[PDB]
Amino acid sequence: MVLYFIGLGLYDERDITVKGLEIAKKCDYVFAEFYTSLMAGTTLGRIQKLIGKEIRVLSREDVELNFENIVLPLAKENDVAFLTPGDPLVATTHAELRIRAKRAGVESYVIHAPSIYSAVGITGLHIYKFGKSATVAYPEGNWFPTSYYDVIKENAERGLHTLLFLDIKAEKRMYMTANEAMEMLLKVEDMKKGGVFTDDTLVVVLARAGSLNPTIRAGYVKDLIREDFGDPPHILIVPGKLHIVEAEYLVEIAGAPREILRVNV
Template identity: 35%
Template sequence: MFYLIGLGLGDSKDITIKGLEIIKKCDRVYLEHYTSILTCGIDELEDFYGIKLITADRDLVEQCADEILDGADKGDVALLVVGDPYGATTHTDLILRAKEKNIKFQVVHNASILNAVGCCGLQLYSFGETVSIPFWTEEWKPNSFYDKILSNFERNLHTLCLLDIKVKEPTLESLTKKKKQYMPPRFMSVDIAAQQLIQIINSDRSSSTGLSVNSLCIGLARVGSTCQRIHVCTISEMSKVDLGPPLHSLVIPNPVLHPLEEEYLNQFKS
C-alpha cells in the first residue's frame, strides 16, 4: 500500500492519529520537504514518530517517483507532505502513477494554508482563485498572478497569495553541467511580495478596480505554529514589515468586507 500523509502546518504533533499509526507500520517513510516546510526539524519528527525518515527532495519526487513507489505493491510505503497531500500537483501525479502500477493507495488529509488562512478572520467561502507570487530576477519578472488578483477583487473575492519557496534549486550555470550546483534556500517574505506587487500596480494604467498601493492586505507568518503572526496594513506599508522567519503568505481582501470580517481584522492592525 502507498500512503500519502498530510503533516499539517505546525510541528511534529500536528499529524493525525490515523497518520501516525500508519507511519509506525510502514517499511519505508519518505519526507517531502521542498514544496513547504514545518517549523520543526527532521530530527524532531523522527524522535516523535520513532522511525528514520528518508528525505525526498525535488529530484527524487519529480524525476524518480518510481523509486518511491517501488515495493509498495508488496509492503507499506508512505510519503509525508507538509499541509495537505492535495495541496500540490506533484502529489496528484504520484497517485496517478500508483494507479498505473495497480498499487493500492490511501490519502490521509490534514490542515493546509488553503483552509488555515481563515485564522485572519476572512470567510473562507469568500476567497477566489489562489495565486502564487514568484521571486523576480533582473531578467525575469512575471506578473500573470496580478490579473487573477484583479479578477478576484472585481468580484468582491479575497485572494490568498502563496509566496515563492526555493529549496534545492539548481543554479543557472550548473544546468548545462553534469554535476548540479544548488542555490541557498530562499523563502519569500511578505515585504518582498508587497514590493513586487507595488511595482506592478504602479505600472498598470488600465486597471479600474480600485486596487492600489493603499489597499488593505494581510501578512501571515508561520500559520499553525505557536509563533504565528498576523499583520494587517496597506500594501505600501506591508513592503516595510518584518514578520520574521518563514513561511509567509499574503492575502488581498476584497474591497467590501463583511462587518464581522472587518471587526476581526482590526485586532491585527498596528
C-alpha cells in the same frame, strides 16, 4: 502493497494527525519531500524522532521523474508512507502520483492534515469569499512574471479575496517575505497601472500558521510594507470588499486600523 500519502500539517512535528502518526509508525518504509514547502517550526530530526522511523528525503526530481523507480517498487511488498508538508495532494503535481501508483498496481490512501488553504481562516476572512489562488514568483533574467497581479484584479473585481503564496527556494532555504511580495506588487502596479495594488490597498499577512503564536497582521500597504512580520514562512492576502464581521475581526484580532470599518466595508 499499500502507499499512504500522509500530510505533516502546518508548522511543526505535532501538526500531523493522530491517524497519520499511527499509520506512519506501522509502515516499513517512510519517505518525505520538503521542496514544495518547509516545516519552519521543526526539523527532520524531530519528525523522525516522533515517528520512530528513519525518513528518506526525496528531491523534486526524485519525485517528479522517478517516483515509480524509488517509492512504488517498495510499496509492492510493504506498507510505504510518503510524507509532505500540509495536506497531501494540495501541491498541484501530487495528485498525478496516485495515477502512477494505480498504474503500478499499487493501492494508495490519503491521510489528510491541515493546509494553509484552510488555516487562513484564522485571518477572520470568510473561506467562501476566496477566489482563484496564485504564487508571487521570483523574477529573473528576461522573465518578469505578472500573472498573480491579474488574479488579484479578477478576484477583487468580484468582491473576492486573493490568497498569495510566496515563492520559496527549498534547498537554499530562501523565503520571500510579505514585504518583498508587496514591493513586487507595487512595481507591477507601476506598469499595469490597473489600480489593483497601491499604497492604499488593504492587505493581510499571516506568518507561521499552525504555531500557537502566529503573526496575523492587517493594514494598508503604506504602513505594513516595512513592518517586521517575524520569521518565515509568510502568506499574503489581498482581501476583496469586507463583510463587517470580517473587518471587526481584522481590527480586534489582527490589529487593523479602525479606518477599515468605513473604508473597506
